[PDB]
Design an enzyme around this catalytic site. Structure first.
Site, PDB file in Angstrom:
ATOM      1  CB  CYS A 385      27.547   5.100  -6.818  1.00  0.00           C
ATOM      2  SG  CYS A 385      27.964   3.731  -7.950  1.00  0.00           S
ATOM      3  CB  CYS A 388      24.840   2.122  -6.631  1.00  0.00           C
ATOM      4  SG  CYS A 388      26.460   1.493  -6.162  1.00  0.00           S
TER       5      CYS A 388
END
Ligand SMILES: [Ba+2]
Length: 483
Positions: A385, A388
């Site tokens: 991700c 993130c």
């Protein structure tokens, strides 16, 4: 050349387009249509098998067609095509009754399915035992028999049509016998499941549907894509036996068929090929060590299973694994009682390293997040991700701000990809929850930019300790100016 999605234009396959489709369907009574785009690799993968099925199937006055959606957008919109390839069957020369083909895109699977579609939805019989003895059935058989009323009959036919590719439907009418509605299951053909006669009720198609969803399931069949949704549609927990060969499955069949008959109404049991589906075990948070027995409560999304070897022990295993009958039997009755402990997926707890950011696993999550001396921020993430990762330096400077000046705040992160957690399951990442206290509501999921100030202010505004991280941040900055 390398293989293309479009069939060779001299084959049995028929090219259909926006201005030719309707006329073609409505002059031909059984047509399999492939809605494809030439850029599609799965569309390319299947072409050889499509042509080979179209050839095999000329014989039967059944057409296979192709529509290229990149040139027939009107047509693709009208048939609500979600993706490629899409295989639709048009029956009865009507462009409004189609069904989807969802099975294996092999020639043999396609010809078998298409020949079935030429068959009547209901078998109308007098000699019912002949009918049931003559065919070896692979699906449940739904039979109306006896004095059948008009209203039920309409519902029955309607269900035969809707469930054409799920069950076989038989009408064995006999005005001298009492009405029955029965299901014959393939393993127990000499012993129907008979509906319990709220007869006015069962001509309601919803009542009929609900009955089928539960009752019309083998006791211990094989699961796969074609049939998974049916087990999900029952509404009931699912027991899986993973097996790595047919002789080994044959050892468990008697026990699981008994467990299944016993608890029919309460849960289901399926066999599942570890060679084909071993992967799915982690989905049940089991290790890939077969055979194995697991139970999935889908409604609650809790998972249960019989103990396994550590990965170390398993890798030094010179023996076949066996599941003991009694352990299986024990877990079933425990699960159904409510006594039985779900399995919680977790990384090894971290030996932990010089970060102010606490790395949590599923194992240690609750203790820490719950602790009333806190304000705990947890970042739920995946390393798969970008966002993130973007946040990392901000998350670290937020953790350092507090580490410098207070113990009233924990800033933590959990890899959700590798760890189960309960009560806090936002779909995407990053997800951020603030746990303020063990006499404080949690209901403080964060929304906002992940900006440092939004996060400081969050913790300040929704935190038990009213820790003003902005002010505190401003402090450090002035004190760093040697002030
Ligand atoms: Ba009659």
């Amino acid at each position: 050349m390398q293989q293309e999605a479009v069939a060779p234009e001299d084959s049995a396959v028929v090219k259909l387009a926006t201005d030719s489709f309707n006329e073609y369907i409505q002059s031909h009574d059984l047509v399999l249509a492939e809605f494809f785009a030439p850029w599609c690799g799965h569309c390319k993968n299947m072409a050889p098998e499509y042509v080979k099925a179209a050839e095999t199937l000329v014989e039967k006055n059944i057409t296979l067609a192709q529509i290229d959606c990149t040139e027939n957008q009107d047509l693709c919109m009208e048939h609500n095509i979600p993706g490629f390839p899409s295989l639709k069957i048009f029956k009865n020369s009507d462009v409004n009754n189609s069904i989807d083909y969802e099975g294996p895109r092999t020639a043999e699977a396609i010809v078998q399915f298409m020949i079935k579609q030429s068959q009547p939805a209901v078998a109308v019989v007098a000699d019912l035992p002949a009918y049931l003895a003559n065919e070896t059935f692979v699906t449940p058989v739904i039979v109306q028999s006896g004095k059948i009323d008009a209203d039920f009959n309409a519902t029955f036919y309607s269900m035969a049509n809707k469930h054409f590719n799920d069950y076989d439907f038989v009408s064995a009418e006999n005005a001298d016998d009492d009405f029955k509605l029965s299901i014959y299951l393939p393993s127990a053909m000499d012993e129907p499941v008979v509906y319990n006669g709220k007869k006015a009720d069962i001509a309601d198609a919803d009542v009929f549907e609900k009955w089928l969803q539960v009752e019309a399931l083998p006791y211990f069949g094989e699961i796969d894509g074609s049939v998974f949704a049916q087990y999900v549609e029952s509404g009931l927990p699912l027991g899986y036996l993973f097996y790595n060969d047919e002789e080994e499955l044959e050892e468990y069949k008697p026990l699981f068929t008994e467990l299944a008959k016993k608890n029919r109404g309460l849960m289901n049991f399926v066999s599942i090929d570890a060679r084909k589906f071993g992967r799915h075990a982690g989905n049940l948070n089991m290790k890939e060590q077969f055979p194995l027995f697991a139970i999935h409560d889908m409604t609650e999304d809790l998972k249960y299973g019989l103990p396994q070897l550590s990965e170390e022990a398993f890798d030094e295993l010179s023996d076949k694994i066996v599941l003991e009958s009694k352990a299986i039997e024990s877990l079933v009755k425990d699960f159904l009682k409510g006594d039985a402990s779900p399995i919680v997926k977790s990384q090894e707890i971290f030996e932990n390293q010089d970060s102010s950011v606490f790395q949590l696993v599923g194992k240690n999550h609750d203790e820490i997040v719950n602790d009333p001396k806190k304000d705990v921020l947890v970042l739920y993430y995946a390393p798969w991700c970008g966002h993130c990762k973007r946040l990392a330096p901000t998350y670290q400077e937020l953790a350092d701000t507090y580490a410098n000046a207070t113990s009233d705040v924990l800033i933590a992160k959990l890899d959700h990809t590798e760890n189960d957690v309960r009560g806090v399951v936002i779909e995407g990442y990053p997800t951020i929850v603030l746990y303020p206290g063990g006499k404080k509501s949690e209901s403080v999921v964060y929304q906002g930019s992940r900006s440092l100030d939004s996060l400081f202010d969050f913790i300040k505004e929704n935190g038990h300790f009213d820790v003003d991280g902005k002010a505190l941040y401003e402090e450090a900055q002035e004190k760093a100016a040697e002030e």
